[PDB]
Symmetry: C6
Subunit: 178 residues, 6 copies
């Protein structure tokens, strides 16, 4: 129920620790963390991808009738917005609802869609620089951000194991431990 994402904050692209809790409940979605509206919408999108694909994910199709879900992104006081945490949100929800832990030294950036495709984001360099400083080994980026890998310093590309992904299935396969 914890994933490292790369997304926009008040001070630039950054490592975010995305948290999701899925305690027994009645189907309420709470999300907090000084989130802007586009980031809030990415969470609804990510939840809908899970609900639509629940059977595929070994999750009870009616799980949202018996679960309350809280997505929180610290630091609580730092403003964050944008769609780039989309695949991280989805991954955290799948982890939480399945009990399948998330890989330690992995981070990810990318906008999610209901169809499960992963869309390119902006400020990739800033994002990959943030993951490099944090000692992140593996980074998932959208397939269409490959062109942007040119602007990145050679030493950072060399240190990072970067995976361009097209689809959410790819993301879950790489990020989850099982």
């Amino acid at each position: 129920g914890q994933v490292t994402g790369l997304a926009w904050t008040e001070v630039g692209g950054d490592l975010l620790t995305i948290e999701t809790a899925c305690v027994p409940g009645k189907g309420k979605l709470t999300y907090t963390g000084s989130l802007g509206e586009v980031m809030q919408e990415s969470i609804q999108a990510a939840l809908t991808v899970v609900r639509a694909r629940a059977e595929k994910l070994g999750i009870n199709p009616d799980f949202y009738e018996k679960r309350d879900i809280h997505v929180h992104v610290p630091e609580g006081a730092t403003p964050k917005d944008g769609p780039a945490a989309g695949i991280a949100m989805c991954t955290a929800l799948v982890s939480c609802l399945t009990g399948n832990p998330v890989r330690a030294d992995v981070a990810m950036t990318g906008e999610i869609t209901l169809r499960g495709q992963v869309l390119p984001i902006g400020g990739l360099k800033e994002k990959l620089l943030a993951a490099h400083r944090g000692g992140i080994k593996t980074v998932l980026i959208p397939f269409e951000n490959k062109r942007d890998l040119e602007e990145i310093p050679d030493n950072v590309i060399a240190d990072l194991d970067i995976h361009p992904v097209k689809r959410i299935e790819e993301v879950l396969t790489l990020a989850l431990q099982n």
Copy 2:
């Protein structure tokens, strides 16, 4: 999830958009997202009402809404968008979702939808068809009263595109759904 390429006004970039609609286990909740302005939001409601009103003839359970939640999402999520032009795409995406009847990926569409299922003309036909052309789209559905606006579209664009002027939502679904 249902999936349809629409042409509708966006604040930045092109007017070519993927209208997405999921119809998951739920209890009759509608969610709509995608940096949508109010007129676009209201077209989602109108589109959903069209399906609800024609559910039996469409091959859908009239009481589907009791046991389904609907999310309508229009990527790219941060791109501000507005207007009624994605209406027929929304209706198509919702019929696809609730029947499991795939949409032709080589077809895009534009047009305002009415509760009577009629397709109304839209503005910026040129903006839209250039996006459809540059987006590699082969077939475009447009409103019937927009036919006279085709006279101001570049010849190559007219040459490349298979434009189909439509009047009614029945025409749209026949032209866009695979079965």
Copy 3:
């Protein structure tokens, strides 16, 4: 005919002027919900709520089952979607459309109407009558229902408008419905002979 159920031409204010409104209503299976859209200003939204109350208050006379109603969702929409509409002048049109939608009673072709609705069923005069009638005249509307108290305002509207339009001044909503709908909405028909 089926296409005439829940479709009413009102005359109210738009961002272009006091023009024609094609007022749409669907009554689909549901749970008692009312939705209204079409870039409506707040005064117009309140007219729709007044109009539905009027219907609900006269449901027995109108033959609308209270329980069927509670298992319907209602959606009033006024295209074109992007054009701002406001004012209380679509009140009787809204009520007509709702009665039509809920009872499967098609609205007569080539009728338009204008008038503010009250909860007591009274039809109150409206403003900009001249421009509304220019709007009806321009759209080949033949029969226009107006408030009985706007009758004095007919004098400033040219002869041909009055020669072309069939104007029926109305006092109450029961009259509107009888004039606007295909079948008589309120009451079983009794046939008598002298």
Copy 4:
């Protein structure tokens, strides 16, 4: 007429004759308040309803009407902004009227702020209110008791034509205004 009360209160064009309408059709307890009402006027409706709820058994009204009835209070004309607490007793009267089927008298107008205790509080702009009523042909006007001192600042010709009843409590209001005794 059941559910209609003539009230005097402020509008954007001044303290004018108001026709307060209420409908109470069977529902689930929904409360709709329309007519370009300002927030203070909206709060007066909620106060008026509370007064009625507390006196429900005393008024012959089934106590659990707040759960089995939908109530819609509307004040034409829809486009004219109305505000203030002066329609309070009129809101209560129309509300009691509707829920009991007890017709309101057409020759009675009324103004006054209502409290949950059912007390009638003095209001403002009494001059405009009564001049309005007088041009409107109203025979009888109920005013707040503490507003009697304001009567001496309105023309003698207007007041002589009016049957003015100063009221202190809501039950007084109801007995003068309802066709049958509540």
Copy 5:
């Protein structure tokens, strides 16, 4: 219906206020009206919580907040009020309403209430106690920590007043309710 004379901030200034409270058959819904500002609104919620958390001690059927609907109104409806200083009045009014224990007519009170039932000091004590006096109020309840603020108000005003500094809500209710809570 409960009624209490509170002293609290109004648009015109700190003044005499009749806090009303009705408690009819209901499903546990809370209504507050009277042009109340947000801090005054939260004071009502704080006051209600005190009563719920102390219900049986107050002799109130603990399950009252699913059997009762509550409306707190403060006339005059058009006069903007705000602040936490009517909190102990709100709570007195609720307790009176839910118990039928009349509140004395010669008593006015001012004070912020906490969930623990503590009375916290308030501002504008001068203008508050002047209003009480002008209204012919006999006894006034103020927060204990407002005692030194009494030395800034005219001695002629204060000498006419029976001033009771309180620390806790049980003092308020014992001093203000006509029968013993």
Copy 6:
């Protein structure tokens, strides 16, 4: 019991907060009042999710979220309060309230809470501990990473407080509550 002294940001008056909570039989309504800023309101949501996640190990009945109404109030009511520093205090108060477990006297605490139960560093530590000291707080729990900031603080202040740098919410409940 349900009463916790937390140190967090205020517009005026000391950075000391008295956090009160009530947990009565109910249908599951959360009320939070006290002129609370959005970030502080969110901190309450987070603290409550923590408690829910750990309800069973905390001896709280799992279905409290639907059998209980909870009102979190922070006096003085007209004093604006904001920020995340009251997070661990909010959690402690809720646990104390739902368990009947009293909080230890003269304990205060500052710290941002995460859903996983990690205590995050805060700002204005100096002002916070000055308020603790004048409040006669003896024991203060701060975030482990605020240890660096203790260097910036007067010697007499450091002297009279029993300052405990904590990493997790388990240390916080152990140091703050009178029972387990």
